Amino acid sequence: MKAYMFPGQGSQAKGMGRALFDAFPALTARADGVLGYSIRALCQDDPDQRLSQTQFTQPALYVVNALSYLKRREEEAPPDFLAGHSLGEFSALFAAGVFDFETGLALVKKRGELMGDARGGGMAAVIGLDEERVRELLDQNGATAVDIANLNSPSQVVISGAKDEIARLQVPFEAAGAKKYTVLRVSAAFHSRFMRPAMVEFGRFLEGYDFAPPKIPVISNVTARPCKADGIRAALSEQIASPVRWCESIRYLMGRGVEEFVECGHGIVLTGLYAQIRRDAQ
Numbered sequence: 001m002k003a004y005m006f007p008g009q010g011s012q013a014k015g016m017g018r019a020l021f022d023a024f025p026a027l028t029a030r031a032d033g034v035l036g037y038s039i040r041a042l043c044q045d046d047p048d049q050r051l052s053q054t055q056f057t058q059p060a061l062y063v064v065n066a067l068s069y070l071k072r073r074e075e076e077a078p079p080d081f082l083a084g085h086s087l088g089e090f091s092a093l094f095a096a097g098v099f100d101f102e103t104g105l106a107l108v109k110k111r112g113e114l115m116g117d118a119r120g121g122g123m124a125a126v127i128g129l130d131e132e133r134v135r136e137l138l139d140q141n142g143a144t145a146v147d148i149a150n151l152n153s154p155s156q157v158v159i160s161g162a163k164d165e166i167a168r169l170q171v172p173f174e175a176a177g178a179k180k181y182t183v184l185r186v187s188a189a190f191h192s193r194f195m196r197p198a199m200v201e202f203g204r205f206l207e208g209y210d211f212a213p214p215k216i217p218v219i220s221n222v223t224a225r226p227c228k229a230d231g232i233r234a235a236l237s238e239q240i241a242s243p244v245r246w247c248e249s250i251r252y253l254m255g256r257g258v259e260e261f262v263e264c265g266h267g268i269v270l271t272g273l274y275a276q277i278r279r280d281a282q
Contacts (some may be wrong), residue, residue: 002258003081006065006083006089007270008085008086010269011270012057012266014046015044020067023067024071027066027101030101031059034106034109054187061087064266083250083253085270086239092218096216096218098211098232107205110202115190121194122160123149123183125158126158127179127180128177130154137176138169146169148160151247153276160190161192206237219249221239222242223235225252246273247277254278
C-alpha cells in the first residue's frame with residue numbers, strides 16, 4: 001500500500017518544478033490566467049523576492065504539487081491514500097477529484113490573500129521536546145496567548161501566537177532541553193486563535209463552492225482521519241485556525257498498512273518527518 005504526501009509552506013525554494021512547466025504547457029498557461037502573472041517566472045527566478053510571502057507562496061506550491069502528481073500518475077501505479085500539510089491538503093483533494101485544477105487554484109489564491117492580510121503574532125519551531133512537555137512549558141511560564149500550530153513529529157512541535165511570548169519562551173525552552181528554538185520568519189500566527197477572523201471569512205467564501213466526494217481517501221489535518229464528502233467544506237474552514245495533526249495522520253496510515261510514503265512535490269521536508277515518526281512507531 002502506498003500514500004502520497006504533499007508539502008506545504010516552508011518547503012518552497014527558487015527553481016522548483018522547472019521541468020514540470022514544460023511538460024504541462026497548457027496547465028501552466030491556465031494558471032497564468034487565474035493568477036494574473038507568470039507562475040513560471042515566479043518559481044524559477046523569484047523575480048523580486050515574493051516566494052517568502054504567503055499570498056504568492058501558496059499558489060506556487062499548489063501548482064508544483066499538482067504538476068508533480070500528474071507526472072507521477074503517468075509513471076507510477078495509483079496511490080492508496082493522500083495527505084498534505086496545511087496547504088498540501090488542497091493538492092491532496094485535487095488529486096482525489098474533489099475539485100479540478102483551476103477551482104483549487106482559486107481557493108488557494110483567496111487563502112493566500114486572507115493569510116497575507118493577517119497581522120499580529122508569530123511562530124516558533126521547536127525540536128527536541130514532546131508535546132506534553134511543550135504544553136507543560138507554556139503553562140509553567142505564563143504563556144497564555146500561545147497555541148500549538150502543528151504536530152509534525154514526536155520530537156517536533158510548532159507553536160504560534162502572541163509575538164512577545166514567542167520571543168521570551170526561547171530561554172526556558174532551551175533550558176528544558178530543546179535542541180533548537182527557531183522563531184520562524186513569518187508575518188502572522190497561523191493555525192491558532194488569531195486566525196479566527198480569516199476562518200470566518202474563508203467560511204463564507206467556500207459557501208459558493210461544491211465539493212465532490214474523494215475517489216482516493218484523504219487524511220484530514222483537523223481529524224487525522226479520512227475526510228467525509230459531507231464535511232469537506234466545514235473542515236477547510238476550521239483547519240486554518242486549528243493545529244495540523246500530521247504525526248497522527250502518518251500514524252493512522254501506518255495502522256492501515258501503508259508501506260510506501262512518497263513525497264509528491266518539491267523538497268524532502270515530509271520525508272524527514274516520516275523518518276522520525278517511523279523510528280518511534282517501529
